[PDB]
Amino acid sequence: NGIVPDAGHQGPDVSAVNGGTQVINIVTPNNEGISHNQYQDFNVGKPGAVFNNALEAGQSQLAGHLNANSNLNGQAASLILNEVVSRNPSFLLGQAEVFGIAAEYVLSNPNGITCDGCGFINTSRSSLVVGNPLFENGQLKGYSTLNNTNLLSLGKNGLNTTGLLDLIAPRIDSRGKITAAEISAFTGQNTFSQHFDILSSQKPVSALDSYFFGSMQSGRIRIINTAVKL
Amino acid sequence: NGIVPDAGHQGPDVSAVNGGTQVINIVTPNNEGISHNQYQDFNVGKPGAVFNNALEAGQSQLAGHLNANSNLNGQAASLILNEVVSRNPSFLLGQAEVFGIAAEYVLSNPNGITCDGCGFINTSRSSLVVGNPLFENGQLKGYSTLNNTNLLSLGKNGLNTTGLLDLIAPRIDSRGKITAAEISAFTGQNTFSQHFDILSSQKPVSALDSYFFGSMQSGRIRIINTAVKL
Numbered sequence: 001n002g003i004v005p006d007a008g009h010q011g012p013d014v015s016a017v018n019g020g021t022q023v024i025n026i027v028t029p030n031n032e033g034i035s036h037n038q039y040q041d042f043n044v045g046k047p048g049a050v051f052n053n054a055l056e057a058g059q060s061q062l063a064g065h066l067n068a069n070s071n072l073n074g075q076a077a078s079l080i081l082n083e084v085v086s087r088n089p090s091f092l093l094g095q096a097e098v099f100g101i102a103a104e105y106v107l108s109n110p111n112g113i114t115c116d117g118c119g120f121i122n123t124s125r126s127s128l129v130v131g132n133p134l135f136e137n138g139q140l141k142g143y144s145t146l147n148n149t150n151l152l153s154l155g156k157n158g159l160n161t162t163g164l165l166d167l168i169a170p171r172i173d174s175r176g177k178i179t180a181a182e183i184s185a186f187t188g189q190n191t192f193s194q195h196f197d198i199l200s201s202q203k204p205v206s207a208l209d210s211y212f213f214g215s216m217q218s219g220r221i222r223i224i225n226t227a228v229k230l
Numbered sequence: 231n232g233i234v235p236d237a238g239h240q241g242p243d244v245s246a247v248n249g250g251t252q253v254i255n256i257v258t259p260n261n262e263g264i265s266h267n268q269y270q271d272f273n274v275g276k277p278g279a280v281f282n283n284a285l286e287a288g289q290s291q292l293a294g295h296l297n298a299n300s301n302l303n304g305q306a307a308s309l310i311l312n313e314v315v316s317r318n319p320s321f322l323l324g325q326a327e328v329f330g331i332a333a334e335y336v337l338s339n340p341n342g343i344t345c346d347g348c349g350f351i352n353t354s355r356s357s358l359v360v361g362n363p364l365f366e367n368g369q370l371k372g373y374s375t376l377n378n379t380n381l382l383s384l385g386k387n388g389l390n391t392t393g394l395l396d397l398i399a400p401r402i403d404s405r406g407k408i409t410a411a412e413i414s415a416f417t418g419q420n421t422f423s424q425h426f427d428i429l430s431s432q433k434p435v436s437a438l439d440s441y442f443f444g445s446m447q448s449g450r451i452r453i454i455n456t457a458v459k460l
Contacts (some may be wrong), residue, residue, distance in 0.1 A: 174460075212460040220456060223451040229443040230404075230459035 002043035004033045006085055010038040013071070018019070018063035020047035023099075026080055033078030034140055036133075037038065042084045042109065042120060044092045053077050054100025054209075061121055062097045069100070076101035082132055084109040089150075092118035093157075096126075107132050107223045112146055113169070116155030116170070127196070128152055130169035134191070142193040145170050146202055149164045158214065165218075166196050179217040188226035201226035232273035236315055240268040248293035250277035253329075255299045256310055262372065263308030266363075274322045274348060283307050284330025287416055290298035291351055292327045299330070306331035310362070311370070312364055314339040319380075326356075338363050340378055343399070345384030346406070354392045356383055357426070360399035364421070365422075366372045372423040375400050376432055382410065388444065395448075396426050402440045409447040415440075418456035431456035 003022050005011035016023035026035040035053075048062040052069040055075045060066045068075070076131040080103050084090060098105060102122050103184035107113060108129040120126035130152045131145040145168065152169035158176030165180035174189055184196065187210045208227045233252050246253035256265040265283075278292040282299040283306045290296045310333050314320060319342035328335060332352050337358040350356035360382045361375040366454060372444035375398065380398035388406030389395070395410035402417055414426065417440045421430040438457045 169412070214458040216453070219455060219456070221451075221453040225449060228447070228451060229445040 001038075002041065002045050003049060004039060004041035004198065006040055008038065009011065010036050010083075010205055012037045013053060015069070016063065016066065018066075020045070021050060021063040023050045023060075023063050023066060024071050025052050025071050026077060028071050028073055029075060029077040030138070032139065033075075033082050034133060035077035036140070036188055037082050038085050040084075040086045040089050041063060041081055042107065044094045045116075047093035048095045048096045048097060051082075051105070052079050052099050053080065056100070058100070060099045062095060066099055072147055077103050079104040079140075081106045081108070081133060081219075084111065085113055088159065089113065092116070095119045095121055097121035098123055106133075108143065110150065112150040112152070114153040114155065115159050116156030119160035120163060123161060125164040125166065125168035127168060129166075134146045140194050142161075142191060142199065143168060143196075144191050144209055146189050146191060148189065149204065149206075150167040154214070156214075168192065168196065170204070171208045172212070174212045174214050176214040178214065179216055181218065182220040182222075182224045183218045184217055185212075186224045186226075187228075190226055198224065198226065201228065232271065232275050232321075233279060234269060235270035236268040238268065240266050242267045245401045246285075246293065246296065246298070247254050250294040251280060252401055253280045253282055253290075253293050253296060255282050255301050256307060258301050258303055259305060259307040260368070261307075262369065265307035265310050266370070267310065267312050268315050269312060270314075270316045271318050272312055272337065274324045274326055276324045276347075279309050279325060280327045280329050281312075281335070282329050283310065283333055286330070288330070290327060290329045292325060293329075294327055294371070295420065297457055307333050309334040309336065309370075311336045311338070311363060316343065317341055321345065322346070323353055325349045325404060326406075327351035328353055336363075338373065340380065342380040342382070344383040344385065345389050347387030349390035349395060349421045351391075353391060354415040355396065356391055357396035357398060359396075370424050372421060373398060373426075376419050376421060378419065379434065379436075379438065384444070387445075398422065398426065400434070401438045402442070403412035403444045404444050406444040408444065411448065412450040412452075413448045415442075415444055415457075416454045417458075420456055428454065428456065433457065
């Protein structure tokens, strides 16, 4: 039970558990193509987790045969935004798979995220955001780490994806190998657009230091600290 | 005698040694504004070195009062390119100052460059290039690390500048603090434009691995490896 959807209108529904892997029927995408999913708890164990973005039944990598997701009402999500609404931090110890149509993937958890052997399957871009998504009259305008001092931690087992990767947090402490098509890490207290452009930055009252003690297997790495040890 | 100009037409002339600091009267800039200076040996010790890009006498940071450089013929350089023509690697243990008009600064040495407590004063951008500048009919077209396996090493005393910084080499091994307005590091066997756009990349027969074991005090860091441990 690592993933516990919210009971409200943006809470998705668990549709299967196959060999220990939770399968999440994400909520209907909005007119911008965003499936905005809310959770009281969001954690992935070794068996991984599947996010069902499929209009046809077929074979998943992590959970065997899966069905179409009727919540999609005929249109797959462009962006799967997973948002923790409680005070609970997230632990990611395995792979998150988008089943069906490839999409962008975001996990936001302003309380903290730890990835230790996590990864992302069938995503064009995946982002881990220790911060709040900013919605304005229902539209996603970006993300905020303002006033936040919490940590994105990457453990010794690292992070892997074939797609693009964004790491957004007040501070980042990484101790393992990060494999991605491109790595963009943005630290400090910032506001961001939906595309992770930095729109504003603020000075924290105390230092927010970040540490990258592992390795980076990627052809392009960008690190922006608006408030870096290697 | 850390800096030994070439005897040919692109060799600059030492115009003073003030408190152990060599003062180099760079050669006349060409019509693109490039002062292309060639050296049999290029090394900077603790006292630093000054590159005279001045149309008026005045006070240098490293070498006291200095005169105008008559080689400029009334026009300061836009880019001061220092190029080692021999097989000798370069060691930079102190500051390189542009006296007079601020300019871009490049040191190229395809045999290897080591910076340990080096830095750059009065430069808009400084670049260390373990590679060859590419001139086509007298015009600077960029730089090449093709076929090169040599090392850019940054030691425990680090590198400091208030301007932009580019680090270009087949491999980079850094063990100290790099302070710069922005840091761009490009590793592998590549061809580059004059602005360090990557125009081509090639696969080395054996791995070229890079290491950044120090820290980076900069708001923007980009690392591109076309063939990275932190």
